[PDB]
Amino acid sequence: YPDADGNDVSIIFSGAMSHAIFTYAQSQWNKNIIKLDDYIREITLTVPKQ
């Protein structure tokens, strides 16, 4: 089923530890996935002013 955003949520039968380890891994990688516009803003701070 869809969430508030466009992501798709899968509700399945699975083990508790496999669920905890997999979902925690998803959160850690998802923290470093950012929009291109935010990426461009980060670079502009590093590069010279012109």
Partner: protein
């Protein structure tokens, strides 16, 4: 240097994932096939068990 190394603020996600699995390995031992206590008893002693 290995002993005294401090975790950087922006640590790689793989380090966080491994620390999560390592913590679960010690906290939840039954999932991985080891325990901290066993009981050896003769057969004629009757004890309540998980039915």
């Amino acid at each position: 240097k290995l002993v005294g190394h401090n975790y950087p603020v922006y640590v790689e996600p793989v380090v966080n994932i491994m620390n999560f699995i390592s913590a679960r390995f010690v906290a939840d031992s039954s999932y991985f096939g080891y325990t901290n206590e066993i009981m050896i008893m003769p057969n004629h002693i009757n004890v309540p068990v998980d039915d």
